[PDB]
Symmetry: C2
Subunit: 346 residues, 2 copies
């Protein structure tokens, strides 16, 4: 059985479905492992490192002989033509409003699994793509901020005086938010955070950060006011509330932005879903009132090497649950992520 | 007496010689201050914040009313033609290789001082521009290295396994290098450094980084993800510390940062003002590095300048460049 690892075609996609270890992992499972020419490039795995990992190098043509396509993003309209009927395609399918494409893939007689649909119970954490990528985006968000910021993050004492620690504020205390807070905290920032779940307070606090909340519809109104107040005083803001499937909540308005001093910087990790931040533009850094608005696409892909490292691990751990290959549509993981099969949308 | 704070005219200069605090100090030392409209822009100081500090906003045509021009970069021929004979001009003059400009300034009858010429004496720490800028540059270096690198710098542990800590080697353990080390350490990298001064091994160990002490070097680099070079000697070419060959041996995707690129660079293949990619190795050669955190850089520089100006109300001998219509600095 042959696993094809595809080169991603999206100009914004530097990640890849296979790693060196992941590929060794695939070999152990008994697979013949093909890698499309140049697939690990954007992710800094040259094809010789794959060959050393057990895989042979191939091209788009071999994809039509694969029993499994491993991939990052949903096959585009011009790629699924290149797979065989009955082929298994595993990727971040982003199915949500993409039923035409889903139908397409059914039409091509493909069996597809959407990794975002992975059950997020603690027993399956090793296959959770949303988390693994979000963990990296949170880190990247602090790097990107510190980059767009015209001041240093740490406080610094020098002969010529002392430059103050930046005040960094993170909204949303999930995977991404935690990591952002931690990355901020090590760079020495004064770090505060907020989350709609008061259970997040415990975790935020344990990172040495300050949970921002009115302590007691009613609350919501007076919360909004504490935040608008806290925000004006901040140097950097990082929103992490990307809800999958859903529109991104507006957490920050032009009006709250407008309260911040010039030179402050904000990162919108939810820009591809509408944005947490009102003035955010997909794949752009815009400035407004001396405030930088950072809305990069595919943030985890900004450290593609690391992202691919983790993602490839997710893929193969999931795949193993299906192994030779014994495809079982009633299986619990399969039933949860299986998106099309046998020419049908399931 | 009147102090003019110039808007920098150089496309790659977002620093300014006057800050809100520094303008307060200037007024307190007996100086009325005129800021050129837009001067604090790149440094996140709106005209209005300058006024609120006691400065009058003006425009270039106003420079001639000043007895003291405070500045970041050396005056252009055009700019100097707009100052009054007799005015003092303090800036990072970059005299080396620009002695015609120095002469131009003498001819214009200016009294010019080059901040970079400050004696590295304990007494003048609070006015050392090289030191204040280098400290920020050292920090900025690691931020940029993190930006171009395709991996995280800290070892992170995820449900999906753990990403390793990047390995970073800082060459030159001076002001820049030390800060670079500290910042790499913060971000939880595996840090190492080298320097010819064996006294630097102390300081480096103390930041929790391993000190390394030509064959050994090429070998050690081959094992690094990230290398930073900070060996900048002012007025002199920069030492080659890393060759094309030492670089041919680095893992694809490794990134190197050359802080000395403005003098030929420490790293063979460095290109000033560019990030170049060869062999899958990125060579980061930005200019005016400290100016990549302008606001914070101007904060320190502006204070250097006022502090220095105060004394003139030894250092003058070492920094004085032109006066009374002549080039007076012995080194020129």
């Amino acid at each position: 059985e042959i696993v094809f690892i595809a080169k991603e075609s999206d100009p914004n996609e530097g990640r890849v479905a296979g790693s060196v270890e992941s590929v060794k992992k695939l070999k152990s499972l008994g697979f013949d492992v093909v890698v499309e020419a140049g697939a690990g490039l954007g992710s800094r795995i040259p094809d010789q490192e794959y060959e050393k990992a057990g895989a042979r190098v191939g091209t788009a043509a071999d994809a039509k002989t694969a029993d499994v396509i491993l991939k990052v993003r949903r096959p585009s309209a011009q790629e699924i033509s290149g797979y065989r009927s009955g082929a298994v395609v595993i990727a971040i399918m982003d199915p949500y409003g993409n039923e035409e494409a889903i139908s397409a893939m059914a039409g091509a007689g493909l069996t597809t699994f959407a990794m975002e649909l992975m059950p997020r119970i603690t027993r399956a954490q090793s296959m959770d793509v949303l988390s693994s990528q979000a963990n990296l985006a949170g880190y990247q968000a602090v790097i990107d901020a510190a980059y767009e910021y015209d001041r240093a993050l740490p406080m610094m004492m020098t002969a010529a005086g002392t430059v103050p620690a930046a005040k960094i504020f993170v909204m949303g205390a999930g995977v991404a938010g935690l990591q952002a807070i931690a990355t901020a905290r090590r760079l020495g920032a004064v770090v505060s955070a907020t989350d709609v779940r008061p259970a997040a307070k415990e975790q935020v606090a344990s990172l040495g950060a300050k949970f921002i909340a009115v302590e007691d519809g009613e609350y919501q109104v007076k919360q909004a006011a504490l935040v608008a107040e806290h925000i004006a005083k901040q140097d950097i803001v990082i929103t992490t509330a990307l809800i999958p499937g859903r529109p991104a909540p507006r957490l920050v308005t032009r009006e709250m932005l407008d309260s911040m001093k010039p030179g402050s910087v904000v990162v919108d990790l939810a820009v591809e879903r509408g944005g947490n931040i009102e003035g955010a533009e997909a794949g752009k850094v815009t400035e407004v009132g001396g405030v930088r608005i950072v809305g990069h696409l595919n943030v985890a892909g900004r450290i593609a090497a690391s992202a691919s490292l983790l993602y490839a691990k997710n893929l193969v751990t999931f795949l193993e649950t299906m192994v030779a290959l014994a495809l079982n549509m009633e299986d619990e993981l399969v039933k949860a992520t299986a998106l099309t099969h046998g020419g049908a949308v399931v």
